[PDB]
Design an enzyme around this catalytic site. Sequence first.
Site, mmCIF file in Angstrom:
data_model
loop_
_atom_site.group_PDB
_atom_site.id
_atom_site.type_symbol
_atom_site.label_atom_id
_atom_site.label_comp_id
_atom_site.label_asym_id
_atom_site.label_seq_id
_atom_site.Cartn_x
_atom_site.Cartn_y
_atom_site.Cartn_z
ATOM 1 N N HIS A 68 0.852 -1.179 0.000
ATOM 2 C CA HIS A 68 0.000 0.000 0.000
ATOM 3 C C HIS A 68 0.885 1.224 0.000
ATOM 4 O O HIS A 68 0.370 2.323 -0.194
ATOM 5 C CB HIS A 68 -0.912 -0.016 1.237
ATOM 6 C CG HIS A 68 -0.126 -0.053 2.527
ATOM 7 N ND1 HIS A 68 1.007 -0.697 2.787
ATOM 8 C CD2 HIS A 68 -0.445 0.684 3.635
ATOM 9 C CE1 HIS A 68 1.385 -0.366 3.995
ATOM 10 N NE2 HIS A 68 0.504 0.465 4.499
ATOM 11 N N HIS A 83 1.827 6.787 0.290
ATOM 12 C CA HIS A 83 1.130 5.832 1.121
ATOM 13 C C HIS A 83 -0.353 5.883 0.869
ATOM 14 O O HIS A 83 -1.019 6.821 1.300
ATOM 15 C CB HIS A 83 1.488 6.166 2.588
ATOM 16 C CG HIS A 83 0.706 5.427 3.661
ATOM 17 N ND1 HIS A 83 -0.559 5.645 4.022
ATOM 18 C CD2 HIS A 83 1.186 4.358 4.356
ATOM 19 C CE1 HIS A 83 -0.878 4.732 4.905
ATOM 20 N NE2 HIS A 83 0.176 3.974 5.090
#
Lengths: 161, 489, 489, 489
Positions: A68, A83
């Site tokens: 992620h 992120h």
Amino acid sequence: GLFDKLKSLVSTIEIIAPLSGEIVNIEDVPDVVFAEKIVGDGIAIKPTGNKMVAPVDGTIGKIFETNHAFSIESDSGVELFVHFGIDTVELKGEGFKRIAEEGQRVKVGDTVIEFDLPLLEEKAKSTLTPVVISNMDEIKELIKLSGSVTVGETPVIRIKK
Amino acid sequence: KYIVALDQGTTSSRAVVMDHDANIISVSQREFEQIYPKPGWVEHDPMEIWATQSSTLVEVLAKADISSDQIAAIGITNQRETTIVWEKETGKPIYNAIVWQCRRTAEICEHLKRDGLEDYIRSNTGLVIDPYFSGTKVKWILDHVEGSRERARRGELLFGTVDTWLIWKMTQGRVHVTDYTNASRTMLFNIHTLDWDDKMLEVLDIPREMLPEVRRSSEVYGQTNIIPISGIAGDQQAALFGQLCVKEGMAKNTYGTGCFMLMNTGEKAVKSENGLLTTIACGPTGEVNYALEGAVFMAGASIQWLRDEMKLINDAYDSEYFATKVQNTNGVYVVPAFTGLGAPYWDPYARGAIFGLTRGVNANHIIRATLESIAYQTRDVLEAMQADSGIRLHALRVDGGAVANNFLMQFQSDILGTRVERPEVREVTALGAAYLAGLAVGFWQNLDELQEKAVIEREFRPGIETTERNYRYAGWKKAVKRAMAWEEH
Amino acid sequence: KYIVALDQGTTSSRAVVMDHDANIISVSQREFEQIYPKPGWVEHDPMEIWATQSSTLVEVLAKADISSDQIAAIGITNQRETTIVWEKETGKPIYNAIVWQCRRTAEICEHLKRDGLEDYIRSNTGLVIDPYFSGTKVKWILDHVEGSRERARRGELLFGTVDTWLIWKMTQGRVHVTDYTNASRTMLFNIHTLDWDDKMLEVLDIPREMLPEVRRSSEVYGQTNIIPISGIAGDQQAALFGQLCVKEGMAKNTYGTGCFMLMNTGEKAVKSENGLLTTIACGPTGEVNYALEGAVFMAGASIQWLRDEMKLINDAYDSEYFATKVQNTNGVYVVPAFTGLGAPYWDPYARGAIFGLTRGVNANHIIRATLESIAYQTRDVLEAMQADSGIRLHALRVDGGAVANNFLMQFQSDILGTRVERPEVREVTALGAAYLAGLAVGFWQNLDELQEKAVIEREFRPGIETTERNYRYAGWKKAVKRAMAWEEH
Amino acid sequence: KYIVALDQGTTSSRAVVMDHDANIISVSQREFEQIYPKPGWVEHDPMEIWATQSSTLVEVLAKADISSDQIAAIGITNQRETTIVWEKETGKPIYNAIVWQCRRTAEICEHLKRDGLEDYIRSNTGLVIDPYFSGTKVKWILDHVEGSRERARRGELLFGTVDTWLIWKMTQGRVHVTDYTNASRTMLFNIHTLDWDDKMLEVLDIPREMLPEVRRSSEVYGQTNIIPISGIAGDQQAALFGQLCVKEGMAKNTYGTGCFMLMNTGEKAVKSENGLLTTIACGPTGEVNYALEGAVFMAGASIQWLRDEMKLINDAYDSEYFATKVQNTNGVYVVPAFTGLGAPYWDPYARGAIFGLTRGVNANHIIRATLESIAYQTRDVLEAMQADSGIRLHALRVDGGAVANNFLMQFQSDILGTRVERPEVREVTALGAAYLAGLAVGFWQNLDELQEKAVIEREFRPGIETTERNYRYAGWKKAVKRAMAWEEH
Ligand SMILES: Nc1ncnc2c1ncn2[C@@H]1O[C@H](COP(=O)(O)OP(=O)(O)O)[C@@H](O)[C@H]1O
Ligand SMILES: Nc1ncnc2c1ncn2[C@@H]1O[C@H](COP(=O)(O)OP(=O)(O)O)[C@@H](O)[C@H]1O
Ligand SMILES: Nc1ncnc2c1ncn2[C@@H]1O[C@H](COP(=O)(O)OP(=O)(O)O)[C@@H](O)[C@H]1O
């Protein structure tokens, strides 16, 4: 269909959009280390379509195992950190698909993580995607840009070293 | 000249010498046995404690020969709450030191909660009805010896925590004294009246003839031949002082055997509505200040367990290396409730536990998870210190044995989301007791002559892993629930 | 002449030779890697499994030179439920062996409980909706490869547990076969109809083109050049057979990697109302008998963990010595739920945990507590085997790797309150597969020629500690509650 | 396309894939058992060797799916001197692989020195009368089987070192071949005539019917279905080649299991007057070049011993950390003469020894001293390579497993007094065998297309401790004297 076999219309330091979407303020992200620049300063992106790209020309550092988020370092010495969403390690990487490897040399626009925004809108706490310079100590001036961006095309941040 | 500091820890006994600047010239340390008679119990031998603390004293002075007449004074810092009771006449203890850790008196704390004597003791002492504090450890020593209490009205035997134990042995029995920070920790002392509470003396039936004269933290209380014994504070209250946390809102966390986080609140006693303690600390001259506190029983004593009983490491220093061999702990949690859970839980019956095990989990996952629980515990009470105060720390000032673990300090920074300031003086508990002694003996004339010695050597900022922060911490939170109330009662 | 036995374990691969009496003349064993891709997951490599099982075969015969024409037949015993799927043509697997232990398919078992397909599968298979069984491990391999299922209707790839895997490789692809005991363990097989269940094939969508021909436990199914391959049974069903537990009410417990306790019930399929499984076993000639079963995942694989990952022992044999250095475990419990909890719990999400820790707990307390959980787990399913049956065992017949631990056998005797019979033949899983092969190939003409070889070498009776039995076991019982449902879902 | 490399080590079996640039795309490694039947003896199982080397092959290709028709060729590098003898017909070995390390044939080398056949064998082979080489290991296999030699004239069984063993198994028995570098190592080969020496065949009585066709290092010798098998060199001669040490005076040292230092000498065979060997190596196209060599038996195999038998470390990587915990070794010396002493000593009867022990010597002193002997041994043969040559190396080019130990590379730099060049490609033994294969198969057209890939990643210069150099080394020198001729004969 899908268009990558097709050649695309092509092209002070810029940081080209890791994702396509609208810019949001870093302080409007609901997570205090981003909202108050503890881990770095930069901006977030409310994403609109399925892949995250290399934001500058450099080497990938860390893709997390939940895929992620990644860190990269431009040859012009800047560490950016992208992120997707917030508190996303809980999903245990479920909606991501790692396209690249941790020591990987790359250029602007080279895919690093593909995602599934329909599942992630439905499950993440937040989908906004912070992109900060995590070596702010090393940099002089930072100008943040605005509005709509498209993955690998539109600039988001101009730094001056 | 110099000032000497006796710092008698839960596990070690260390003496340290200071010159007129502030420097450490010599430090001797002498570790000793931990006695566990039954599982939730810990005990030290009062004589093994004085034996070690004398050795050290007659070792720093020799280490670089200097004695009695190049020394201004002696400061005393000591581990808090462990109760000793001895024969006044023979100077022989009628039992072992029932340590602060020990869970033996949980049954007495239950009778005290049954009586509805819960709100009285939080109000008049700032403390919690828990085995930790001294009060009911004295009742257990008296209730298990035959005739000890009648003999205590007739004055043949008297009470003391380790500061009054050590000064008595040093002053051939003459002076028998506690300070304010050390007296407050007994549950037998009023924090408002600043004198022994007489309801608290009646419900546990301690003869007031046992108690010490609660003197103050900076003041010459006697001499020592072995010379002015001029300072005393509980080791966590002197570490707050060596850290110069002498004004309100200022705070520190010690990663010693346990983790103790205190915050100066000045002239006000703040009621904790979030599992913390209201204690006493020193102000810029050694006067009564109040403080706010979180006590966790279990920090580097967990690394002592992996080294001595489990034998997984040989040095506690080795914990950094094996812990940074793996990257994560594979899902494993360690809850160091070896002597129940301190703040903010206060569960006597909780025991240590390891969780989430799989066949691929190796010893480095367990070592890394032991280091992680020190950090998560610190997040538990910091999170509580903000709810009780209102303040939001943007840095964390630390000290202790365990702050030399760079992985722990960094992991502490990521799980908290704040910076972690680390001094190049690790020994600030001793120093806090020495400044306390120098003060009374006219050696320093207050803290501004010592401000320029708080260099904050390394600083730890949240790296990019601080985004796992809450996910990692929610696994710690459901792990603690399951180690709670293991022991049946 | 001789009969050869291939016994392919969860951790080892062993080949063993027998003469016409029953003797073991040579035993070769070749341990191999356990692959854990994610925490609750286990996997073996199909090729590392055949590589090892061939090595052993071409090793017992050489060890004392004998080959192809001093050998009547080959028997095959194998670890149950681990699913393999391979390319028929290339003989190359489209994945690794998803082991019986592995918890990966818990989500598929949840959809199956959501549908109300709970009572159908207990009725037609005797099994429980749990990741253990083969069924849903095949769905996961097909749902993760691209095009594997359409290719499975067109027949390019086919399913098999380890018995059909090994015989295919031995018979150059010709015969592709399972036996009854091994087929029943898949959750895809009707235990009444004694053929693949077609509702169970539809809900998980497996093409019947994948499946083997479920032949029988004693019967020549093919030849081997490498010669009649004549016996097949799941290793726990062949251990019941080497133990000559071939009549109803007769039972045994294997302390292998996991602990498996089975009881022959003859011609009747008994419904378990107490968390056990209704499986298939052999009768005196290798015919279908039903059996009753308790499967615990975790017996000597826990001693493998202390040796390999924790590094607390060097040999598994050393566990007896360090465990009998202490006398008790200080209050410590170990729950080996490394791959969830098998019978009678059937909790996919439970993980391993250690409990009741104190600072005085050392490594010998943990080692002794690991050995103790093997015994307590066995009490859990024995207690269940009596409630389901009605029988009350007054002795317990055992076999396995771990029965050579005298402390475990004795502790098993005290916590149970029954005698524990131990054979001088530890290798009865291999033998049970060999008798099974000798039978079909006319080498023996049934079990009475093998009765006089069940010497029950050591016997273990309840010493005076069996009076702690229930106290010790109630601590195990509240420990398991807390390791349950750790993994979140 | 790609080129595959089989690199079959003394301890591991590794396969590695290369693209047209030079990159390593995948590397699989499969470690196997070392058999010690008696103390100075080592043996591997020929089948355990092929089992592992096949696994790896059918693992790199799958690891990233690629097979048979994206591959130009296969190169073979192998550990030298270990002798195998097998049944031509059955492809089954009449014994185990008697390893290069093994000291078993010292008695045969004694008869050969008694005969005055010392100067003949140094002259015609470049070698020393020592158990290391293949020659007399073949006599021992023939002298211990009953009828093996007559059967060897009638051709039923044939000889080979590991390169000819592996290619035979890969080419279903068709081609049976050695290369020049690998044949020279047997003591049965003339290094001048470049063909099997017939006096050396008579004194040990080997039937020439056993021997291979000594082909060349780059040349397609056969196909493989499993496809052109085009390269072969002994692993130390291919590491010299991956290092592009292809011109005279160029040299490298490998810190593998043993330490092997070679120097290219071009078209001239130099007589060693200082305990070194005159061997054969490749020139820029894979032609016969001569080389100069020092073989020490014992480098990282000593770290394998501390990890597996002594159990002092868990990883070989951990040796750097524990070794740099102490600063010195307290006076301790370790002489790893586990299989006698190689160059320049050549003592079959020397055994391993630890020296200078005191009560304050701990395990980190022993670990640091084991790492030090790798460095001192390298100084012994480097010091000899200069006396034989005339050249003075001002840097040292290295490769191997053990070059990733930064402490060893730095300690090597200080004890030598030269710089130590380290590549970012650690795997140059495989690469040297692959270039060797690419060459023959027209994939590369010689070394200048591979020059720009010898980046010399880290460089190690003599720090200020190089002033202890000689003092430290004189303690090593009197230590070796005392481990010499331990075994009685
Ligand atoms: N590198 C380290 N990592 C973790 N814990 C450590 C380390 N070094 C020391 N410790 C622990 O710190 C404790 C000593 O801390 P210290 O503050 O000096 O004593 P005390 O707790 O008695 O006041 C011991 O429990 C020791 O195991
Ligand atoms: N002395 C022992 N005490 C406890 N466990 C043991 C002992 N010896 C062997 N074991 C364990 O027994 C298991 C081997 O049992 P075995 O029945 O032969 O294999 P399997 O479980 O694969 O069928 C291993 O998991 C090993 O750790
Ligand atoms: N960090 C290290 N320090 C010392 N020795 C090491 C280290 N890493 C690996 N080794 C040793 O190096 C050897 C492996 O070297 P390598 O050249 O790959 O194999 P080989 O000797 O079989 O050709 C092993 O003997 C191993 O113990």
